[PDB]
Amino acid sequence: AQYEDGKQYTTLEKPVAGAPQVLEFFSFFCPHCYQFEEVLHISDNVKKKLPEGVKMTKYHVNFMGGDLGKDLTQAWAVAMALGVEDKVTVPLFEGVQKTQTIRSASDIRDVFINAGIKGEEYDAAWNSFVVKSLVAQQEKAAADVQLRGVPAMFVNGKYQLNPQGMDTSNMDVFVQQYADTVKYLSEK
């Protein structure tokens, strides 16, 4: 059979209900995450091939980057709440990993202000119930799958993508194999 358990994906021993259809975890400190999102365009592709009515969810994790990692999880909650994911993702990756100009919560705030968000509005969002709830949601989701590393992607809280088990030579084929695996799993 084309798709084999342990090859393109693994099956969670204890799946959790109410899980997002397609859930991606990442960290702005995570170099392979940077590669997935900005070089291979994994999420772009996944989305291209997702069936109708299937949405992609992406959460940040706390466990990379020391305490700043936690601030980045809250900043990502702000990005989701304000709908600016597609404006701040590059300056956050670049600021953490490339130029190393993001070292403190204030440096994160500066990225949002530089992208056109008013400081007063960033601060209001930062302290909002929506963002507090989103932070807890991101942390619970990681706990629910006993998440130990990123990048990671889960389908319906039942299956975990296993890129290590895919074609690791031809990246164009790899990227579509990853996307096709998500599509196939979503149809299960």
Q: How many helices (H) and strands (E) does the chain have?
A: 7, 5
Q: How far is the CB of 36 from its own copies (least distance, A)?
A: 10
Cβ closer to ligand WF4: 82 or 153?
Answer: 153
Give dist(CA 121, CA 118) in Å, integer: 5
**1: partner contacted, choices its own copies, ligand WF4, Cu ion, none (Cβ within 5-8 A by kind):** Cu ion
Q: Which of residues 47-76 bind ligand WF4 (CB under 6 A)?
A: 65-66
Which of 39, 124, 136, 143 binds ligand WF4 (CB under 6 A)? It is 39
Should residue 110 be labelled a site residue for its own copies when binding is judged by CB under 8 A? Answer: no
Contact window for its own copies (CB under 8 A) among 10-18, 53-61, 66-74, 81-89: 66-74
- Cα 181–187–188 angle (5° rounding)? 95
Q: Which two tokens stand for residue 126?
A: 């930062």
Helix axes 119-126, 67-82, angle to 10 degrees: 110
**142: partner contacted, choices ligand WF4, Cu ion, its own copies, none (Cβ within 5-8 A by kind):** none
152 three-state secondary structure: strand
Should residue 106 be labelled a site residue for its own copies when binding is judged by CB under 8 A? Answer: no
Cβ closer to its own copies: 34 or 122?
Answer: 34
User: What DSSP string describes 60-99?
Assistant: E-SSSSTHHHHHHHHHHHHHHHHT-HHHHHHHHHIIIIIS
- Give the footprint of its own copies on this chain (CB under 8 A): 29, 31-32, 34-35, 38-39, 64-68, 94, 96-100, 103-104, 168-172, 174
